[PDB]
Enzyme design. Structure first.
Site, PDB file in Angstrom:
ATOM      1  N   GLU A   1      21.640  36.488  85.364  1.00 12.28           N
ATOM      2  CA  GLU A   1      21.575  37.789  84.673  1.00 12.28           C
ATOM      3  C   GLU A   1      22.334  37.794  83.338  1.00 12.28           C
ATOM      4  O   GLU A   1      23.532  38.061  83.287  1.00 12.28           O
ATOM      5  CB  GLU A   1      22.122  38.905  85.552  1.00 12.28           C
ATOM      6  CG  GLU A   1      22.016  40.293  84.904  1.00 12.28           C
ATOM      7  CD  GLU A   1      22.487  41.457  85.789  1.00 12.28           C
ATOM      8  OE1 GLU A   1      22.860  41.245  86.959  1.00 12.28           O
ATOM      9  OE2 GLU A   1      22.496  42.608  85.288  1.00 12.28           O
TER      10      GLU A   1
ATOM     11  N   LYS B   1      17.122  37.636  85.733  1.00  7.85           N
ATOM     12  CA  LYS B   1      17.260  39.080  85.733  1.00  7.85           C
ATOM     13  C   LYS B   1      17.707  39.498  84.345  1.00  7.85           C
ATOM     14  O   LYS B   1      18.902  39.617  84.073  1.00  7.85           O
ATOM     15  CB  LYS B   1      18.273  39.533  86.798  1.00  7.85           C
ATOM     16  CG  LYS B   1      18.549  41.019  86.794  1.00  7.85           C
ATOM     17  CD  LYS B   1      19.269  41.467  88.070  1.00  7.85           C
ATOM     18  CE  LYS B   1      19.608  42.946  88.019  1.00  7.85           C
ATOM     19  NZ  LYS B   1      20.169  43.467  89.324  1.00  7.85           N
TER      20      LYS B   1
END
Lengths: 348, 348, 348, 348
Positions: D188, D230
């Site tokens: 992420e 992500k």
């Protein structure tokens, strides 16, 4: 602040449209950009004297093949040929246009050893490149090619960091200069098959090289949508007594690409290296049985399209029809292979 | 496995010996490598027509100055001049040899914009460079020069990462190619003074650029012992109404170098950029009052050595003696400044 | 826009002043930061049981040596010791202060294998580091130490790119965090002597590693003026039957440093690795006969200062005077070696 | 020689199988890994006191929602929750298993400022990570999450090179450590929406960051086949008065991914950032009308799945059925959006 200026939408559109035309389904590239010297070799293998006249006859034989454009989207030319006429006096580019084949041009100036390496090569040609691209576009070229070469030698640590860094830098500069001049760049980082290494070693090296190449393309503001890649397939080294199976070559080749190549790139047009005409077709076919893919997997073949054509021509002009027949047979084989429909003739 | 092949001890010794001769105490470089076009400008400022004959007269005026070699260790030439004769018919290189001045040669092919940057420049010239170096060595050159240029513009993020990466790559390739051909490379990453930025901004940028340059020199197996650096001094931007004091310029310049330049490098030969003859001398002098240093801090000056010489010559050949007198005055000033003995004429 | 915020002048001054105090002429560092486990080993070699009480007795023996501060500028402590009392109840830091020895603290959390490498090690410890530094400063530490380790193995390509990249990243982060908390960071990239490689191989690897380390220090805005380097000397591998001569070790070690280390760094404090007490002194002495240098070349020795001290102590407290005598003999030897005055006891 | 050791085929297979299960068609991730403090905020917005008991009630409310596994493939947990019991005494992981939802675990230790940056953040957590992963696997987790954060500020040059380099390094180390311990890493790199920049600026920055991230993943031998990304969607900055259209957000988001993400990665699970529940669904839906894609484009949503659920719960346990109803409505909306079937509720 500090990012790439935006590319002209009009220029980008032309590049992306032409790259997709080159990477068209069921089609690929004919690599006919052998230098004066490289072609001497071929002509020798059939006892033909490397005159301009003979080079012109042969390139005419290739490009005037009726119906070639069914399977060939583009043809990479040597500079001589881009400005040459057929014996009958028709410009080579006009023969290509009549078949709807896009002309391309080799723009590198060949290889030079990197100082204090073990004969590892830089590709030269950036000086004047932008101006050459302009002239070549006016002459009818719409894509370009620049070949870099790397070697595998575990004992010597090849390819070294300096080799990979240099290859990536030259390719990225060349690609951005091409795109500034409305030419689609074919990015060719060729890892040579020399040596006795396994296919898994080729896979590792190919992945490292392509990761470096695509990072450098990004750094240099290269538009992937308007570029093409021309990599080696992933194979055993050429000194291996057993060649890898077609299934294996297809598996590791596709894996290496999916691990490194962003899918905005429209096409991967493989070089055939030393492969037989039949292996080159069967290996491509096997990859496209594994489809569908995120980019077109196709061909940019020289010898793998020309070997038999030449052997059939023999320098004899009455052998011209037979020679074009076998070129067509191979163009068809590779077009069908692009579609995964050639009928012959997971590890992490 | 995977490291640089060792450089020839014999080649390395020659390079290191010649670099130390160039960076000799009390001496520096005369930069007389103005291109055909750049010299047109100078000649214009005194109403002289840029004929070959006039360029030859003037370079003769410079290089036949009696006793010049007391203060000048080397002279950077343009290619024309390296193969030129004085009006009297004496080869320019022979005039240099008679004063014991080492001939050098500019080997870059100038600047080209990096695609999709805001007019940031790549330096061109690697193609054929190795072969040019061989010829230039045979002609009597023993060092080379390659100029890269960077700009400071905070609003535009200049110099961008791509600019710095390109400058470093070109310099490192050029330097390794020179050393393979027995020429000492002068590494010139010039950060232009354009703009309104403070001296502290120049310091930050210079440090980032030099850190990148020396990392790339290491990556390319460049022998620091046989190389020279020709950087900008650290100064306010040229649009500043107040120029930084000599003490300030000396402080930040030395700081930027000691923060980035390994001490195996024998010499730092500053460019003067737009500085007056007197500022260029006083700034160097101030740095060498701060001595002793880990490398020689000296000069490679064009205008800062020639401005008055030209204004005194005026194109009139009877003004030749007066012109050489003022060249000598400036050569002496800068030689004395190298020693911290010119009499005029910590922040982290 | 986009550069490092300027460091506090007040913080920078303290760091630079303390780094210069540590790298003081005729002095060096006593490395006494053996962990609970590492010290078990030493204590075993003389049949002492690793109780807290014994560790405290021994560290007291070391630090209460009368006149030690003539030759020792600083002492690297393990965390236990920084907060420990001598048997007599005197805080260890107070024993150091009485001799004018600066306390330092080991702050890394040791080594962990990099996934999918052949046992190549990352150094751990950045989490909580900033907060630990604050506490350690309040406790009296003014410098820190973080050890990274690399291996040479040509057959395995060690040190790999990932190893070097990781070592440099960890060191640079650690160094910047230290400086933000008013601690001088000792940067220790130790290339292990394991293997049969030649001194020239050690030189190549050391140069590549240090070039990477100093580029990363620059990238992370580390103030070189307020840092110290603790590298391996350049030597043959430990499996070589012939150890390199002192002259050779001195030559390649100094060369590797001058090729990579900017001279704004105040001091290079060598680790001794596996060297004898006498070799460690003679090698340092030989380097400082080659002076003067652009940075102080000195020592940060553990075993090379302690080996005989321990053997003389034997765990017997009546042997305390004799043990401190031999510590002093070695402190004196290495202080004299720093000056190139220890009397015993060019390739490119 | 010098390449990554091969990953265990058995470990790789598990990772790839679990990553594909997480990136299953018509499904996505519920992000419920709010820390003790982050959840205090949510609970405040409905006047609930942040007791363990209440956190347990609410996580139970979420995970015991009947039929949730039709739309939710995985749930990211905070460490507390991974080892927690529902009020009724049922382990949270057992509630997940009953719906066939895969448990995941947040493993970073939060953010710390990079020294001498303008508040740019490093993500901490590598120390002990390998050992934590082992324990979390034994507890039932099969994937992990590590959040890095970058800011856009053209005036300040953010994200700076140091920020991007740090984010990429931390993510790559974390990912390789996860995979060594049989956990699928969610990578992420969140580019925050803070500021007034255009969507095209977000696109440029996202592309630069993802290019750097995937190059570092390659450098660290991360298996893309067993990882997930992500990222932020590409949008205008949050201070823009006009939000970009769903069509625009979908176009630039997909473009940024196809330009940088190799297609061996199985899934891209978007964070929703500050988006409304409805925008988050419609933006995802719009991307999957543009399908089919080379990787699954899906969701890992916290607030965008929970906002209404919470507002409906209000802390009142009799509101539990209504709260689970609206969670289901949003799970269904986003599952349908994954398929490009949610009905509401080229630039180069």
């Amino acid at each position: 602040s500090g990012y790439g200026l935006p590319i002209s939408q009009e220029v980008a559109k032309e590049l992306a449209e032409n790259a997709r035309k080159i990477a068209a389904p069921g089609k690929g590239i004919l690599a006919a950009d052998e230098s004066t010297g490289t072609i001497k070799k071929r002509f020798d293998s059939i006892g033909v004297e490397n005159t301009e006249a003979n080079r012109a006859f042969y390139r005419d034989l290739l490009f005037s093949t009726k119906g070639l454009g069914q399977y060939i989207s583009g043809a990479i030319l040597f500079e001589e040929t881009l400005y040459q006429k057929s014996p009958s006096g028709v410009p080579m580019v006009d023969l290509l246009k009549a078949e709807g084949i896009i002309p391309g041009i080799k723009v590198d100036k060949g290889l030079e050893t990197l100082p204090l390496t073990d004969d590892e090569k830089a590709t030269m040609g950036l000086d004047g490149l932008s101006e050459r691209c302009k002239k070549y576009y006016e002459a009818g070229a719409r894509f370009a090619k620049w070949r870099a070469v790397l070697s595998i030698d575990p004992a010597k640590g090849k390819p070294t960091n300096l080799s990979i860094t240099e290859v990536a830098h030259g390719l990225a500069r060349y690609a951005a200069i091409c795109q500034a001049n409305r030419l689609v760049p074919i990015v060719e980082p060729e890892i040579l098959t020399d040596g006795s290494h396994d296919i898994t070693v080729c896979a590792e090296v190919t992945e490292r090289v392509l990761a470096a190449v695509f990072k450098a393309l990004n750094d240099h503001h290269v538009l992937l949508e308007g570029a093409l890649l021309k990599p080696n397939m992933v194979t055993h080294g050429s000194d291996c007594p057993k060649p890898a199976s077609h299934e294996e070559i297809a598996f590791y080749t596709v894996r290496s690409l999916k691990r490194t190549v962003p899918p905005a790139l429209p096409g991967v047009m493989f070089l055939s290296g030393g492969q037989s005409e039949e292996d080159a077709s069967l290996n491509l076919n096997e990859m496209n049985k594994m489809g569908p893919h995120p980019f077109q997997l196709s061909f940019s073949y020289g010898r793998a399209l020309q070997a038999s054509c030449l052997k059939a021509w023999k320098g004899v002009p009455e052998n011209k029809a037979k020679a074009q027949q076998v070129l067509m047979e191979r163009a068809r084989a590779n077009g069908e292979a692009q579609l995964g429909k050639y009928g012959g003739g997971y590890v992490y």
